[PDB]
Every structure is written in C-alpha cells, then in structure tokens.
Amino acid sequence: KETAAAKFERQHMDSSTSAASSSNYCNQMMKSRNLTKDRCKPVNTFVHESLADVQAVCSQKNVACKNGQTNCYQSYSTMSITDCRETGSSKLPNCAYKTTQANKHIIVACEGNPYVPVHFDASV
C-alpha cells in the first residue's frame, strides 16, 4: 500500500504555491489530495516549501514527541503553512473548511532509510 512517507507528501506538501491565495484553498486542496473521499478529514496542514526543505527537518531539532517516541523534529526556521479545519456544519460530499495562513515552525515524526517525515505533529 501507500507508504507512510508517501502519505505524508500527499497530505502535507504544497510546493507549488507560496501560500494559500484564497479562503477556498482548503476546500480545493483537501479534495485534490483525496482527503474527503469517504469522510471529510477534519484537520490538516499544508506546508508551502520544497520537499527538500521539509525532509531536511529530520536532521534539525530533535524534540519530545507527544507519544513519547524519540523521532520528532522541529524545524529551525518558520515555514509558510496553511491550516485547514472542517467547519462545524460541513458534511459529505461537499466538505467545507476554514483556511488559515501563517508562518510557523513545523514538528514532524521521522522514520526509515532515507530518514524522512512520516507524520505531521504540529506547527509552532
């Protein structure tokens, strides 16, 4: 099946735009990345940076994970990110989301060889 690293790319990477350009960004992106097929994924974050920049975070600041594992890393720099959160009234098939653009550090869990992001934990 889809590997955790590949799923991370599909769910969290947006290297083609420097930032969310409209309030409709999330509605469109959540569908384009197949996150509303049989259920509206309630919350998601997209990172507007190159894949290389996000992958590099795995060798940046090692920080504690919520789950106690030792594989979480925080980026040294802020990155352009868009937070997407399903509205309280949203429902299939037309999932509705609130779009929020900001510049924050990201925290991801890394695994494998190559040692790359497999889960997006939070943005600070």
Swiss-Prot record:
<feature type="disulfide bond">
    <location>
        <begin position="40"/>
        <end position="95"/>
    </location>
</feature>
<feature type="binding site">
    <location>
        <position position="66"/>
    </location>
    <ligand>
        <name>substrate</name>
    </ligand>
</feature>
<keyword id="KW-0540">Nuclease</keyword>
<comment type="subunit">
    <text>Interacts with and forms tight 1:1 complexes with RNH1. Dimerization of two such complexes may occur. Interaction with RNH1 inhibits this protein. Monomer.</text>
</comment>
<dbReference type="GO" id="GO:0004540">
    <property type="term" value="F:RNA nuclease activity"/>
</dbReference>
<dbReference type="GO" id="GO:0004522">
    <property type="term" value="F:ribonuclease A activity"/>
</dbReference>
<feature type="glycosylation site" description="N-linked (Glc) (glycation) lysine; in vitro">
    <location>
        <position position="7"/>
    </location>
</feature>
<feature type="glycosylation site" description="N-linked (Glc) (glycation) lysine; in vitro">
    <location>
        <position position="1"/>
    </location>
</feature>
<feature type="disulfide bond">
    <location>
        <begin position="26"/>
        <end position="84"/>
    </location>
</feature>
<keyword id="KW-1015">Disulfide bond</keyword>
<keyword id="KW-0378">Hydrolase</keyword>
<feature type="glycosylation site" description="N-linked (Glc) (glycation) lysine; in vitro">
    <location>
        <position position="41"/>
    </location>
</feature>
<keyword id="KW-0732">Signal</keyword>
<keyword id="KW-0255">Endonuclease</keyword>
<feature type="binding site">
    <location>
        <position position="7"/>
    </location>
    <ligand>
        <name>substrate</name>
    </ligand>
</feature>
<keyword id="KW-0971">Glycation</keyword>
<keyword id="KW-0964">Secreted</keyword>
<feature type="disulfide bond">
    <location>
        <begin position="65"/>
        <end position="72"/>
    </location>
</feature>
<dbReference type="GO" id="GO:0016829">
    <property type="term" value="F:lyase activity"/>
</dbReference>
<keyword id="KW-0456">Lyase</keyword>
<dbReference type="GO" id="GO:0003676">
    <property type="term" value="F:nucleic acid binding"/>
</dbReference>
<dbReference type="GO" id="GO:0050830">
    <property type="term" value="P:defense response to Gram-positive bacterium"/>
</dbReference>
<feature type="disulfide bond">
    <location>
        <begin position="58"/>
        <end position="110"/>
    </location>
</feature>
<comment type="similarity">
    <text>Belongs to the pancreatic ribonuclease family.</text>
</comment>
<feature type="binding site">
    <location>
        <position position="85"/>
    </location>
    <ligand>
        <name>substrate</name>
    </ligand>
</feature>
<keyword id="KW-0325">Glycoprotein</keyword>
<protein>
    <recommendedName>
        <fullName>Ribonuclease pancreatic</fullName>
        <ecNumber>4.6.1.18</ecNumber>
    </recommendedName>
</protein>
<feature type="glycosylation site" description="N-linked (GlcNAc...) asparagine; partial">
    <location>
        <position position="34"/>
    </location>
</feature>
<feature type="binding site">
    <location>
        <begin position="41"/>
        <end position="45"/>
    </location>
    <ligand>
        <name>substrate</name>
    </ligand>
</feature>
<feature type="binding site">
    <location>
        <position position="10"/>
    </location>
    <ligand>
        <name>substrate</name>
    </ligand>
</feature>
<feature type="active site" description="Proton acceptor">
    <location>
        <position position="12"/>
    </location>
</feature>
<feature type="glycosylation site" description="N-linked (Glc) (glycation) lysine; in vitro">
    <location>
        <position position="37"/>
    </location>
</feature>
<feature type="active site" description="Proton donor">
    <location>
        <position position="119"/>
    </location>
</feature>
<dbReference type="GO" id="GO:0005576">
    <property type="term" value="C:extracellular region"/>
</dbReference>
<comment type="function">
    <text>Endonuclease that catalyzes the cleavage of RNA on the 3' side of pyrimidine nucleotides. Acts on single-stranded and double-stranded RNA.</text>
</comment>
